[PDB]
Design a protein around this ligand. Structure first.
Ligand SMILES: Nc1ncnc2c1ncn2[C@@H]1O[C@H](C[C@@H](N)CC[C@H](N)C(=O)O)[C@@H](O)[C@H]1O
Ligand SMILES: Nc1ncnc2c1ncn2[C@@H]1O[C@H](C[C@@H](N)CC[C@H](N)C(=O)O)[C@@H](O)[C@H]1O
Lengths: 249, 239
RNA sequence: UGGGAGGUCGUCUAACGGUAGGACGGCGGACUCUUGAUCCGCUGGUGGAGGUUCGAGUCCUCCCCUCCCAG
């Protein structure tokens, strides 16, 4: 079957239950499609006080993570993963994640994700132990665990069998480089807003064209830059032109 | 002054990841942050506690059921009282950045709706949501991680607890030992002269922002000092 | 509203001139789930008149509606 192994270095491994025990990802773990193993630098501290942070040279802001426990946890994980494992550091200074980046990352059979805490980690550990740096966004969080879980989740949607029997038709934003179209479910009418008749028509071809047209229109209006480097069928061009002409004028 | 966050989620226990650990966890124990959850499942009225439903027009996937979700949001909105903004986590919403974080931070109470499956009914977005927010241009299986990400980012602004502070990437950091794998700490950081260090670190932030994320640089009004240091760094990059 | 072609459940697709079926949809139900998974019932059609024939979705006439070709 399909399997992916993700090694994680984190002071708070229990946080990862958030993805391993719940939802689609929880079932994927429960079906062995996805494996996540964690190592905690705290289990590697020679300190009698199980101390895991150290002071930054130059004084200043907060604390940095202590080098020894963190380095030892990385070497232990790296050794267990064996050969062919790419080591990633979660950091806001890293490559900003997008769907293309998710597909590329999804190209790895094994990954080790290093989650920082405090002011971050010693720059030299990054030079000597890290392969790639990735950011989940231009904002600062208190630790790398949320970013790591985010990365894991995004790639897990790409593991065959995770979403279910023939999930090729499963529609989500960016999946095909376009934003998703709007969705509707029961009731037929509530809060005075009805459902577009075409979705109730049972007319298959029109529903397909409506959905595609909605997706093009929404992408155009909210995120056109996605539109700048896209490959499209004649049908998509036509459908988009209809949409731009109609919202406009 | 503290922050209150309402959350609508089918998996409220996921939020322990932020309420029981690290800085945000400490914030919770000291009552500097409250995170209350409502689960649409507690609002169902059927034998199987159904919280999803099929989308009209057929095809694969499910959407969240309108009624339980709606009822939960109205209940949370009711508990929050006046002034609570309802935010829906979605990849089609406004992309979070440090500015968006500061604006969200102004709000005293927020309610966060976490989607699952293929999403939520469009009419709920039109009728119950004030603003839509995305954590990035990629797709997740649920809104819980994005909700926690947002909560974590804004919590940093809660009294009693910088990179992006000035629009720049952070500078590199070092701690003991002085030599690690043949790599020594830059002498300036050990010189003990606060002024030389400040200028060195600032020069590093400027250089790094330029090299990794030059676009961040376009929107800024650098001080005379910053312009000089960046100019120096660009000259060193390829002299 | 000139010259060709064509009308079957909401849509798609079958039926020798012999009891109109299937898939999807819509409604509803089980799975005993967090099932973005899979099953199971129910609903529903020959556009309309004539006529031929023991019998017509099918063949003939007319009417109507629809697509294609220059309004
Ligand atoms: N946007 C982000 N993407 C990836 N990791 C992040 C992000 N924001 C914070 N982190 C991680 O969580 C912690 C953030 C803080 N320790 C501050 C980090 C520090 N500003 C730095 O330059 O790395 C670090 O471990 C970061 O790696
Ligand atoms: N980029 C994102 N930012 C914030 N929330 C997200 C993001 N991606 C997915 N989600 C959450 O994940 C839930 C389930 C998603 N599969 C829904 C995606 C939806 N079909 C769309 O493409 O717009 C969504 O309802 C959101 O709550």
């Amino acid at each position: 079957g399909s399997h992916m192994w993700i090694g994680v270095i984190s002071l708070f491994p229990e946080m990862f239950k958030a993805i391993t025990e719940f939802g689609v990802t929880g079932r994927a773990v429960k079906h062995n499609l996805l494996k996540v193993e964690c190592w905690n630098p705290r289990d590697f501290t020679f300190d009698k006080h199980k101390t895991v942070d150290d002071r930054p040279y130059g004084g200043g802001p907060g604390m940095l993570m202590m080098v020894q426990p963190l380095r030892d946890a990385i070497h232990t994980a790296k050794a267990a993963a064996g050969e062919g494992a790419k080591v990633i550091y979660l950091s806001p200074q890293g490559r900003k994640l997008d769907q293309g980046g998710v597909t590329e990352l999804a190209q790895n059979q094994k990954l080790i994700l290093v989650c920082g805490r405090y002011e971050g980690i010693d720059e030299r550990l990054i030079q000597t132990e890290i392969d790639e740096e990735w950011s989940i966004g231009d904002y600062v969080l208190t630790g790398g665990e949320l970013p790591a879980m985010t990365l894991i989740d995004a790639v897990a949607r790409f593991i065959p069998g995770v979403l279910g029997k023939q999930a090729s038709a499963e529609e989500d934003s960016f999946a095909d480089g376009l934003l998703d179209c709007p969705h509707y479910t029961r009731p037929e009418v509530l809060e005075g807003l009805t459902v577009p008749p075409v979705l109730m028509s049972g007319h298959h071809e029109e529903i397909r064209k409506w959905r595609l047209k909605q997706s093009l229109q929404r992408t155009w209006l909210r995120r056109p830059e996605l539109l700048e480097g896209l490959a499209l069928t004649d049908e998509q061009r036509k459908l988009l032109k209809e949409a731009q002409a109609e919202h406009n004028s």
